[PDB]
Amino acid sequence: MGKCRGLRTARKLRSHRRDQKWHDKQYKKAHLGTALKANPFGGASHAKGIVLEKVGVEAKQPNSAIRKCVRVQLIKNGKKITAFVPNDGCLNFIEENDEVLVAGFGRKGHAVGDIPGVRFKVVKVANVSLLALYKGKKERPR
């Protein structure tokens, strides 16, 4: 309680709630829209780009590994993202200065696992999925 409970206090309630909703964390990203503007995506699930150069990222402690990322610039916003390559040895199935299709990690703007600075992964290298390259259901077209 600690609040008015008149029968004519609809205004003082409905204007108060509309204000104290802005302090909520979820709401403040959704409704200012600065989230979208800042994102390298337009708010689309995927996006398409062109590879710039392979890189390797050294994982945050205590784990030690090299995580074989790429760096890609996008078509639809012309700006750059550092993107993970999943499975094993799929670095080889990516070849520089071609198109790729990117996709978010699965934690909505926040780095996943022990790798820092990488919020994206890669799905298609030339209309052929990393899954099908790895399994052998399709082959890289050269």
């Binding site: 008149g6 029968l7 004519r8 206090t9 609809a10 205004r11 309630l13 409905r14």
Partner: protein, 158 residues
């Protein structure tokens, strides 16, 4: 009051004529005015002041031309200083289904005041009625004024 002409154009009642026809004290009457009035109908009362009085106005419904038909509403005076009109207010309560509380909202509207009524003051109750447009912000006219129904303006000790 005896003179009500002051305009560029002559002020008169339409639907009245002035004769030159003979009388034994002529020419040609004894004030040259047979007064015009009409009833509103509906069950609202005609005032004495109109039938007695002398004024030229066309936006009043007692002497002028304008019908009252459709809605009927009330209000209260809040302000006036305008020429042959006033401002009034309508307090009411708006409900919200998300809560179960009410809250206050008001609108203000102007409405034309007859030269017949000459006893109005701020805070007097008023009743009004729907009409065809008369002006940009006038859609109504007064039909009746009433006061001494809540906080009197006078007291008896005579």
């Amino acid at each position: 009051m005896a003179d009500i002409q002051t305009e560029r154009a002559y002020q008169k009642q339409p639907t009245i004529f002035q004769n030159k026809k003979r009388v034994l004290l002529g020419e040609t009457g004894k004030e040259k005015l047979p007064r015009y009035y009409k009833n509103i109908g509906l069950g609202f009362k005609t005032p004495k002041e109109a039938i007695e009085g002398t004024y030229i106005d066309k936006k009043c419904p007692f002497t002028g031309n304008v019908s009252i038909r459709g809605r009927i509403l009330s209000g209260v005076v809040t302000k006036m200083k305008m020429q042959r009109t006033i401002v009034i207010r309508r307090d009411y309560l708006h409900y919200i289904r998300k809560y179960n509380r009410f809250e206050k909202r008001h609108k203000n509207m102007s409405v034309h005041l007859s030269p017949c009524f000459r006893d109005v003051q701020i805070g007097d109750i008023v009743t009004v009625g729907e009409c065809r447009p008369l002006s940009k912000t006038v859609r109504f006219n007064v039909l009746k004024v009433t006061k001494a129904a809540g906080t009197k303006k006078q007291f008896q000790k005579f």
